[PDB]
Structure 1
Amino acid sequence: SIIHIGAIFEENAAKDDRVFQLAVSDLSLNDDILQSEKITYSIKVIEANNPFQAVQEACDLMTQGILALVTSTGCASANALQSLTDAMHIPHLFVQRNPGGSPRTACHLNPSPDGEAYTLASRPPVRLNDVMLRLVTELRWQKFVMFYDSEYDIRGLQSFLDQASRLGLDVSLQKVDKNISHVFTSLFTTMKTEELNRYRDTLRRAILLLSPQGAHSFINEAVETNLASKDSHWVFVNEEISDPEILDLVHSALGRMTVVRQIFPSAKDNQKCMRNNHRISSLLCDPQEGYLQMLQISNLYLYDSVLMLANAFHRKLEDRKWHSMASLNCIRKSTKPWNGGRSMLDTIKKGHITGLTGVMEFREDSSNPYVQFEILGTTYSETFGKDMRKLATWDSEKGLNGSL
Structure 2
Amino acid sequence: SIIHIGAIFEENAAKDDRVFQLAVSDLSLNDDILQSEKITYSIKVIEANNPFQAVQEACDLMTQGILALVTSTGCASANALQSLTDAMHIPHLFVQRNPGGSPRTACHLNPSPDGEAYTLASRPPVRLNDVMLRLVTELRWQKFVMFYDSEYDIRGLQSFLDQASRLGLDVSLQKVDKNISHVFTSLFTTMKTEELNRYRDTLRRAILLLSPQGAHSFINEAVETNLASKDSHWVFVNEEISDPEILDLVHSALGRMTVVRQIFPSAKDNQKCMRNNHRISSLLCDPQEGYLQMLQISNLYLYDSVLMLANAFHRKLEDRKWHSMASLNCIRKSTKPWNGGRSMLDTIKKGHITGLTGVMEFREDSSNPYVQFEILGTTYSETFGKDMRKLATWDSEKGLNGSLLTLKVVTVLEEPFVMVAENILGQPKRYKGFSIDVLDALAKALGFKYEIYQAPDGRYGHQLHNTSWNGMIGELISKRADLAISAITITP
- Alpha carbon RMSD of aligned pairs, Å? 3.5
Deviation at 1:139, TM superposition (A): 2.3
Residues 1:391 and 1:209: Cα distance change in structure 2 (over 3 Å):
same
Matched with 1:254 is 254
2:283 and 2:386 map into 1 onto residues whose CA distance is 34
Encode CA deviations 1:5-37: one digit per residue, 9 max, x unaligned: 222223433434333333334443444444586
Gaps spanning 5+ residues in structure 1: where?
none
1:102: Cα distance to partner? 2.0
Contact 1:258 1:378 (C-alpha < 8 Å) held by counterparts: yes
For 1:294 and 1:178, the matched residues in 2 are separated by: 18
Q: Measured at CA, do residues 4 and 268 of structure 1 come closer, stay the same or move farther in structure 2, by a change above 3 Å? A: farther
CA-CA distance at 1:116 after TM superposition? 4.1
Check 1:141–1:7 CA distance in 2 against 1; reply closer, same or farther (3 A cut): same
Query: More displaced, 234-243 or 288-297?
Result: 288-297
Give the structure-1-normalised TM-score.
0.84
Would the alpha carbon gap of residues 6 and 288 (structure 1) be closer, same or farther in structure 2, given more than 3 Å must change?
Answer: same
The CA distance in 1 between the partners of 2:294 and 2:28, in whole Å, is 24
In structure 1, the residue corresponding to 2:85 is in which secondary structure?
Answer: helix
Distance 1:30 1:397, change over 3 A: farther
For the residues of structure 1 that align with 2:281 and 2:132, how far apart are their CA atoms?
40
Q: What displacement does 1:155 show?
A: 0.4
**C-alpha distance 13-299 of structure 1, shift in aligned 2 (>3 A):** farther
* Conservation of the 8 A alpha-carbon contact between 1:236 and 1:260: yes
Query: Could you list the runs of 5+ residues in structure 2 that have no partner in the other structure?
Result: 401-492
Q: Distance in 2 between matches of 1:248 and 1:271?
A: 28
Q: Is the alpha carbon distance of 1:304 and 1:160 closer, same or farther for their aligned partners in structure 2, counting shifts above 3 Å?
A: same
2:309 equivalent in structure 1: 309
CA contact (8 A) 1:301 1:357 kept: no
- Once the two structures are superposed, residues 117-173 of structure 1 have per-residue CA deviations (whole angstroms, 9 ceiling, x without a partner) of 343332121222232222432222222121111111000122121232244432221
Q: 1:261 to 1:243 in 2, by over 3 A?
A: same
On the 8 A contact 1:73/1:97 being kept in 2, the answer is yes
Shift of 1:273: 6.3
The verdict on how the C-alpha distance between 1:37 and 1:83 changes in structure 2, with shifts beyond 3 A counting, is farther
Of all paired residues, the percent bearing the same amino acid is 100
CA distances 1:202-225 after superposition (whole Å, capped 9, x unpaired): 111121122323322333333333
Q: Is the 8 A contact 2:264 2:372 kept in 1?
A: yes
Distance change in 2, residues 1:367/1:279 (3 Å): same
* Higher relative strand content: 1
Kindly state the Cα deviation for residue 326 of structure 1 after the two structures are TM-superposed.
1.5
Task: Name the stretch that deviates more: 294-303 or 157-166.
Answer: 294-303
- C-alpha deviation, 1:260, in angstroms: 0.8
Displacement of 1:193: 4.0
**Cα separation, partners in 2 of 1:39 and 1:119, compared to 1, 3 Å:** farther
Match of 1:63 in 2: 63
Distance change (3 Å), C-alpha of 1:261 and 1:108: same
Quote the Cα distance in structure 1 between the aligned partners of 2:220 and 2:270. Answer: 45
Distance 1:28 1:351, change over 3 A: same
CA distance in 1, matches of 2:104, 2:64: 33
Q: Does the 8 Å contact 1:122/1:305 carry over to 2?
A: no
Give the drift of 1:67: 3.0
Counterpart Cα distance in 1 of 2:84 and 2:284 = 32
Q: Which residue of 2 aligns with 1:158?
A: 158
Taking structure 1 as reference, are residues 81 and 69 closer, same or farther at Cα in structure 2, changes over 3 Å only? farther
The 10-residue stretch of structure 1 (67-76 or 114-123) with the greater mean CA deviation from structure 2: 114-123
Which protein, 1 or 2, shows the higher relative CO under an 8 Å CA cutoff with sep ≥ 6?
1
CA separation of 1:329 and 1:213: change in aligned 2, threshold 3 A: farther
Q: Secondary structure at the match of 2:387?
A: strand
2: CA distance, partners of 1:320 / 1:216: 56
Contact 1:352 1:361 in 2 (8 A): yes
- Between structure 1 and structure 2, the one with the greater Rg is 2
Offset at residue 332 of structure 1 (A): 5.0
When residues 168 and 301 of structure 1 are mapped into structure 2, their CA distance, relative to the original with a 3 A threshold, is: farther
- Comparing 56-65 with 323-332, greater Cα deviation is found at 323-332
- 8 Å CA contact 2:115, 2:364 repeated in 1: no
How many Å apart are 1:275 and its aligned residue? 8.8
TM-score normalised by L of structure 2 = 0.70
Tell me how far apart the structure 2 counterparts of residues 107 and 83 of structure 1 sit (CA, whole Å). Answer: 14
Q: Aligned in 2, Cα 1:183/1:31: closer, same or farther, shift over 3 Å? A: closer
Instruction: Give CA-to-partner distance per residue, 1:237-268, whole Å, 9 cap, x none.
Output: 11121244323432223422211111234665
Q: Is the 8 A contact 2:176 2:183 kept in 1?
A: yes
1:291-316 deviations in whole A, cap 9, x for unaligned? 76666233222431233244244333
- Confirm or deny: 8 A CA contact 1:20 1:306 kept in the other structure: no
